[PDB]
Amino acid sequence: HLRGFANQHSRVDPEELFTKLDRIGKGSFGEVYKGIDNHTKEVVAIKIIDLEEAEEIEDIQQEITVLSQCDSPYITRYFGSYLKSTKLWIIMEYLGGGSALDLLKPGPLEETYIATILREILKGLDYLHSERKIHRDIKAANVLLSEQGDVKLADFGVAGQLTDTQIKRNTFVGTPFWMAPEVIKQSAYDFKADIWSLGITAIELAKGEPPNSDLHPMRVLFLIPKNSPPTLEGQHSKPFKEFVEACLNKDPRFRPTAKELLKHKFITRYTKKTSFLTELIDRYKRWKS
Ligand SMILES: CCN(CC)CCNC(=O)c1c(C)[nH]c(/C=C2\C(=O)Nc3ccc(Cl)cc32)c1C
Numbered sequence: 001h002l003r004g005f006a007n008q009h010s011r012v013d014p015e016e017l018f019t020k021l022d023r024i025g026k027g028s029f030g031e032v033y034k035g036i037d038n039h040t041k042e043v044v045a046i047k048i049i050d051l052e053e054a055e056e057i058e059d060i061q062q063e064i065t066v067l068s069q070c071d072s073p074y075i076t077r078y079f080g081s082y083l084k085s086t087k088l089w090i091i092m093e094y095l096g097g098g099s100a101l102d103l104l105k106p107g108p109l110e111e112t113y114i115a116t117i118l119r120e121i122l123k124g125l126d127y128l129h130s131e132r133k134i135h136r137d138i139k140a141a142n143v144l145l146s147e148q149g150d151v152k153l154a155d156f157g158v159a160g161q162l163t164d165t166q167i168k169r170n171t172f173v174g175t176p177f178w179m180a181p182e183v184i185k186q187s188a189y190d191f192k193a194d195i196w197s198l199g200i201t202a203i204e205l206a207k208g209e210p211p212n213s214d215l216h217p218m219r220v221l222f223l224i225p226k227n228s229p230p231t232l233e234g235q236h237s238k239p240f241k242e243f244v245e246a247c248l249n250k251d252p253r254f255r256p257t258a259k260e261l262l263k264h265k266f267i268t269r270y271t272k273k274t275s276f277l278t279e280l281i282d283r284y285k286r287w288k289s
Pocket of ligand 1: 098155
């Protein structure tokens with residue numbers, strides 16, 4: 001019956017207030033478009049969700065709630081939501097540099113870039129975890145950059161909320177290659193699931209693809225809780241291999257917090273400013289052009 005659902009959104013037709021432009025990517029329940037707020041003229045990202053198609057409605061509601069409860073320069077900003085029949089327009093912050101996955105397209109990343117990106121992801125994780133929120137879908141595709149090199153976490157479509165009522169989660173959610181073993185087994189889990197997913201993302205930043213990409217997603221789901229954790233192989237520095245090993249511990253009790261990882265040798269070795277990442281944005285622009 002969706003009682004109280006429409007009350008939370010502006011019933012004003014979003015085509016009058018916003019000018020919809022080109023598609024820039026996709027989200028958990030819809031397509032992401034570039035837009036301009038007709039009043040301020042300011043650039044925005046618009047996510048259009050078909051409620052009849054994604055009828056997943058509890059999760060759409062979860063993403064709305066999560067985004068409106070976050071207030072951090074490390075989390076994509078939310079500007080409201082507009083309903084137009086079965087379509088829901090979610091207006092968010094515009095990040096012109098695209099994703100960390102988009103940025104791997106022209107070629108491999110030097111270690112200096114990887115350490116800077118991981119440091120900024122950790123600042124985002126530290127904020128979420130302090131707010132008792134778990135992202136649950138940490139991967140390069142969900143790490144976005146502004147045209148100035150600011151790194152932000154996006155896509156709260158499967159995000160979890162811990163309380164004094166619910167100390168742990170048990171929901172089976174995420175993308176197979178990046179999923180923590182306790183998530184797959186549906187054991188009671190917390191913020192430590194994002195730490196494991198960050199370790200998979202660290203390998204993905206170094207290799208362009210997560211570990212065991214040569215395997216079928218369903219085979220990987222069956223093997224993650226049974227096999228030894230992945231390792232960073234090949235020509236990479238010892239502190240980088242150590243950072244990955246710290247994240248990829250099968251026992252969550254031994255995985256460090258985001259705050260601890262911000263003190264890791266791999267993260268502290270390089271002291272690049274986020275503006276350093278604009279070179280990757282320029283490289284991607286030259287490659288696409
Ligand atoms: C088809 C995608 N294409 C690569 C071939 C373009 C690369 N991506 C972008 O240009 C891009 C841009 C400029 N902005 C975004 C995504 C945004 C974005 O800008 N804000 C935002 C908020 C929430 C979510 Cl889930 C996603 C986004 C994206 C994916």
